[PDB]
Enzyme design. Structure first.
Site, PDB file in Angstrom:
ATOM      1  CE  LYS A  68      -3.835  -1.917   0.015  1.00 17.64           C
ATOM      2  NZ  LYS A  68      -5.217  -2.338   0.525  1.00 17.64           N
ATOM      3  CG  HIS A  86      -6.496  -3.048  -5.150  1.00 20.30           C
ATOM      4  ND1 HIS A  86      -6.796  -3.419  -5.611  1.00 20.30           N
ATOM      5  CD2 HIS A  86      -6.444  -4.121  -3.949  1.00 20.30           C
ATOM      6  CE1 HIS A  86      -8.460  -4.221  -4.500  1.00 20.30           C
ATOM      7  NE2 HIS A  86      -7.501  -4.286  -4.131  1.00 20.30           N
TER       8      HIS A  86
HETATM    9 ZN   LIG Z   1      -7.379  -6.238  -2.163  1.00 16.78          ZN
END
Ligand SMILES: [Zn+2]
Ligand SMILES: [Zn+2]
Length: 217
Positions: free
Chosen positions: A159, A195
């Site tokens: 992230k 993502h």
């Molecule tokens: Zn995810």
């Protein structure tokens, strides 16, 4: 009408599959997984969200002469596990950690047929390694290491731009887990997040920084 499943070669024996879900909160969300080739056999690293996209992914590889030998789900969320029901129904072996399977069981979801525990688990000896860095994005998040190519599938643990949804997250543990991950795989050539765009080892440092920043606040 969601975007089409995408399959793009990343490196020798490694493909990135991208599937899409609608989410009122941003909008359409891309999710990256891998397909890893081991001698005319294919391993799914995460499933797409849906049975249909999982079938499209399997068929694309089966029609190019690859037997689907297994799938591994990096965490219990549907963006890693959505395909497990379909794969189980086709007698394709599915793998997830004891922690992932317990979270699937708790949420009334169909479990992977095969489980593992421990810091380190070889799915394919010397070719596909599963690593548990500790809780972060979810309690159960694992990463998948391809030692031959120095490719790390970080999945939803990685992230680098912000921690995203904290609903299932362990903000206290994430900095320790991310420190451990950066130490273990600092020599990664490619880091594949769940993502966001494929990057280098810098996504491990950026993830650590977001986890530290997130804990502070
Ligand atoms: Zn995810
Ligand atoms: Zn997730």
């Amino acid at each position: 009408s969601l975007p089409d499943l995408k399959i793009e070669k990343l490196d020798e024996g490694v493909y990135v599959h991208t599937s899409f879900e609608e989410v009122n909160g941003w909008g359409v969300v891309p999710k990256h997984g891998l397909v890893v080739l081991v001698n005319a056999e294919a391993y799914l690293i995460d499933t797409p969200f849906t049975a249909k996209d999982t079938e499209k992914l399997v068929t694309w590889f089966v029609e190019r002469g690859y037997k689907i030998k297994g799938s591994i789900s990096s965490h219990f969320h549907s963006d890693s596990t959505g395909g497990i029901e379909w794969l189980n129904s086709r007698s394709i072996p599915t793998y997830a950690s004891e922690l992932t399977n317990e979270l699937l069981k708790k949420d009334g979801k169909v479990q992977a047929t095969n489980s593992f525990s421990g810091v380190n688990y070889w799915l394919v000896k010397n070719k596909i390694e599963v690593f548990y860095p500790g809780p972060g994005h979810t309690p159960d998040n694992v990463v998948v290491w391809l030692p031959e190519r120095k490719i790390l599938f970080g999945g939803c643990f990685i992230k680098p731009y912000g921690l995203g949804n904290l609903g299932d997250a362990n903000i206290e543990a994430w900095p320790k887990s991310a420190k451990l991950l950066k130490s273990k795989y600092g020599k990664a050539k490619l880091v594949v997040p769940g993502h966001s765009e494929v990057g280098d080892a810098s996504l491990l440092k950026l993830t650590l920084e977001q986890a530290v920043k997130g804990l502070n606040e």
